[PDB]
Amino acid sequence: SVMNINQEQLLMFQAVMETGSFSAAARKLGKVPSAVSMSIANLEIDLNLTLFETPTAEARVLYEKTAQLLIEMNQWKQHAHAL
Amino acid sequence: SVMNINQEQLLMFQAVMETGSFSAAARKLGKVPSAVSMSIANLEIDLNLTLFERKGREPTPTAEARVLYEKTAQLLIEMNQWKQHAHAL
Amino acid sequence: ASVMNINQEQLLMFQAVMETGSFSAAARKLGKVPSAVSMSIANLEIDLNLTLFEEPTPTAEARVLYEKTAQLLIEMNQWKQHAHAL
Amino acid sequence: ASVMNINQEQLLMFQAVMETGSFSAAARKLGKVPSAVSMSIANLEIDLNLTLFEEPTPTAEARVLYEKTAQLLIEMNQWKQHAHAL
């Protein structure tokens, strides 16, 4: 279910899109490759979408919308820090 | 730290603000009252501020809680809009 | 018109449009017909003398108004419950 | 009618009648005319489907409603200030 998706999953997905591989994403995020692989698989399950064959067309759109969500999650953090 | 805050905590916080008490929030969410109390306490620790004071039986939100409620409501719009987009793919 | 003329129904319709991103999605969420959402939002814009929507997207003013309305609705929903119980 | 049709003007008129004990005293306090107070209160009674006054003395329902109403009026005033500033 889409309701099961968490922030960690979204960050891992974004890193794979940005860097072009699971191992490059792991390096960028300071995570273990196993964690990236598992997170992406779980995201595909939750969305019931194939995200990688190289990204699918659906992954390209999801990347754009996720980037916006993450910006707003970080705007929340800025507000929370300022209180 | 702020980085430790999760969605469950924020939904609990919103429910306390909306219902007016820890026990009413727990009832609404199908949780144990002490679980709601402890989650809010952990949120206060993470944000390093007081969200509720207890001067007259039921908790009164602080000024910081009022703002946090508003900003969290805005985040929840964005989270729900993301879910709508994800469902449509 | 006047801010004093704004009613709870208008605020609930506005909240639903803000949350869902469209008049038709708001209608579905609220169990109201699109005509009702459109009319309520138009009336709200008139009463506030603010343009709230401009693929209708919220204005900057609508963004802020969402936050303040959410706050008012904490007390307003409790009050409505009390009124219903009398 | 419907509790959702209640507006801030109605609740301010209600508060003034509760405080002052009469439509004309409320009108004086608010800088409005008695006709406006009478009409607003009637409309509020219709929307709540509650008789609020029976010179007008409050019903049991009015007295009980008012305590919670005072709190909502605080938030309505703050909301209006924000709306005016947009």
Look at chain B and count its residues: 89
Rounded to whole angstroms, what are the CA distances from D86 to B67, C62, C66, D74?
A: 18, 9, 12, 19
Q: Which two tokens stand for residue D62?
A: 């009015």
**CATH code that applies to domain B2-88:** 1.10.10.10
Is the CB of B88 inside 8 Å of chain A's CB atoms? no
Beta bridge partner(s), residue B77: none
* Number of neighbouring beta carbons within 10 Å of residue B41: 12
Resolution in A: 1.7
Look up residue A38 and give its two tokens: 């598992």
Method: X-ray
Topology of C3-85 in CATH?
Arc Repressor Mutant, subunit A (1.10.10)
To test the contact with chain C by mutation, choose from D3, D9, D37, D48 the residue with the greatest count of C C-beta atoms within 10 A, namely: D3
Q: Which residue, C1, C20, C12, is CA-closest to C58?
A: C20
In this complex, is the C-beta atom of C85 within 8 Å of any C-beta atom belonging to chain D? no
Q: How far apart are CA C46 and CA B68, in angstroms?
A: 30
Q: Return the CA Rg of chain C.
A: 13
CATH, domain range A2-82: 1.10.10.10
Mark out the alpha helices in chain B (DSSP H runs).
Answer: 7-19, 22-29, 33-47, 63-88
Distance CA A27, CA A29 (A): 6
Q: For chain C, what are the domain ranges?
A: 3-85
Tokens 């107070």 -> residue: D37
Q: Do B78 and A65 touch (CB under 8 A)?
A: no
Residues of A in contact with B67 (CB under 8 A): 79, 83
CA distance C38 to C10: 10
C-alpha–C-alpha distance, residues A27 and A12, integer Å: 11
Residues 6+ apart with CB under 8 A from B60: B52, B53, B54
Take residue C83 and report the two structure tokens written for it. 């009124």
E strands, chain C, where? none
